[PDB]
Amino acid sequence: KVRRIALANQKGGVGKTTTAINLAAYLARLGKRVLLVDLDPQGNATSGLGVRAERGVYHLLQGEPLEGLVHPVDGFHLLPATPDLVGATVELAGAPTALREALRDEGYDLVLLDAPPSLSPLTLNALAAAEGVVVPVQAEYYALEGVAGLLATLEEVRAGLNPRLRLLGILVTMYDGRTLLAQQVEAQLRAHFGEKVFWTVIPRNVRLAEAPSFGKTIAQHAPTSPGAHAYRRLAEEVMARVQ
Amino acid sequence: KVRRIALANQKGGVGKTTTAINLAAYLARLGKRVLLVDLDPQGNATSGLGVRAERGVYHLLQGEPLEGLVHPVDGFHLLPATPDLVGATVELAGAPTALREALRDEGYDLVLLDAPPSLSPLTLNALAAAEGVVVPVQAEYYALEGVAGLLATLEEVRAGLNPRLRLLGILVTMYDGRTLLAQQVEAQLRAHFGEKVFWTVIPRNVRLAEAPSFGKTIAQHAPTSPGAHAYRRLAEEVMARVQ
């Protein structure tokens, strides 16, 4: 049963964090108890939610209880990241199952882990603790090789650190509807990865791009904008795959 | 092997014909030899393609060869409808497998049949000749009962007239992104019909609404408009289901 979902890609980007934030927002609206964990030392998800805490995931790995670290936001709970997270990576290196053993989130239906790019010990800890992975990529030709690399990594992590790790799906984000180039890249992603690619595609849209600067989810910022409708649908497609 | 696809719903509407026209346009661009047959005495698809012929499907049932009746348009072939089609319905009634035996389209990869609403002898002839059905509905609450009715009809037609008849999918069209009501209706359609509903949803959009008046497919009229991107993706989702 997929309960923990890691959001990860090779190069990171706004699409990944925007996906973590909004997937969480809509899964919550579907009536799910959801925990979003910002595992990036940069704290993009945390900042994208207008949160400013001095206690975060580092303390979770540092022993301090979860219930007193989570911040309620837009219907779900966030375990924030701080510039303190950086410390644990030095030590998490060589300790891949750290996060997993420290994630006493049995009280949630779904747990989303916003992993940093470039496979750092934090990214690895996310992959070692998750059961499903959503790979958010931009509609650019590099995504073909970028995804291939990440899938090979997932295979190796499944084989040596986490047997229940599986790809939930590849998500095309920042689809530039102004061009036909976007169409061509998507077509090639589907031709090469097939059913692994979600049918729901997130469009490039001004309101979606600005939501993080406002520190609000797209549901809060512009609930009827194209990106909001797409993320609402994605939550449904993600639940369909989980089931 | 699904080769013939009927586009049908209970109440008809612009979404159905817009779907027949644009699905054909994009399946053609995928490198498929496609034949679109307008089976509606109203000739909405034919008019939506800027065609004006005096010879159509009636003559096909009237003996005259297909090759000399098809009109090339936007990369595919159209077997037009005329105000003459009405005649055959009187006689097609009681002759459900007429169209099927007169459809010598072995030269095409895919054949789309734009069926009239209200289950007329022409609608029935479409269902008796097709292998797959795409049910285009609008994101309105009536769609719940409208679809249920059509699915019951498909079941009965499969049982008594065409064993290979199957639902390819239910397509939500004219999704009004200005409201959250659209979201609620879609959610209910998926809750009630599940996987039968295509993940690709066609948005309500000005350029898409106007394409028929210009007599052009959305690919010709506004190739980078939201509806164009959605129909391009739908063709891919439809091919995935056919396979």
Question: Concise description?
Answer:
The structure is a homodimer of 243-residue chains. By secondary structure, chain A is of the alpha/beta class. Chain A is built from eleven helices and seven strands.
Explain what this protein looks like in three dimensions.
- The structure is a homodimer of 243-residue chains.
- Chain A is of the alpha/beta class and 243 residues long.
- Chain A is built from 11 helices and 7 strands.
- Chain A has a single domain (1-243), classed as 3-Layer(aba) Sandwich (Rossmann fold), CATH 3.40.50.
- Chain A has a 7-stranded mixed β-sheet with strand order 3-4-2-5-1-6-7, sandwiched between helices.
- In chain A, a hairpin with a 2-residue loop joins strand 3 (71-73) and strand 4.
- Chain A is globular, with a radius of gyration of 17 Å.
- Chain A binds chain B through residues 175, 177-180, 182-183, 186-187, 190, 195, 198-201, 223-224, 226, 229, 232-233, 236-237, 240, and chain B through 175, 177-180, 182-183, 186-187, 190, 195, 198-201, 223-224, 226, 229, 232-233, 236-237, 240.
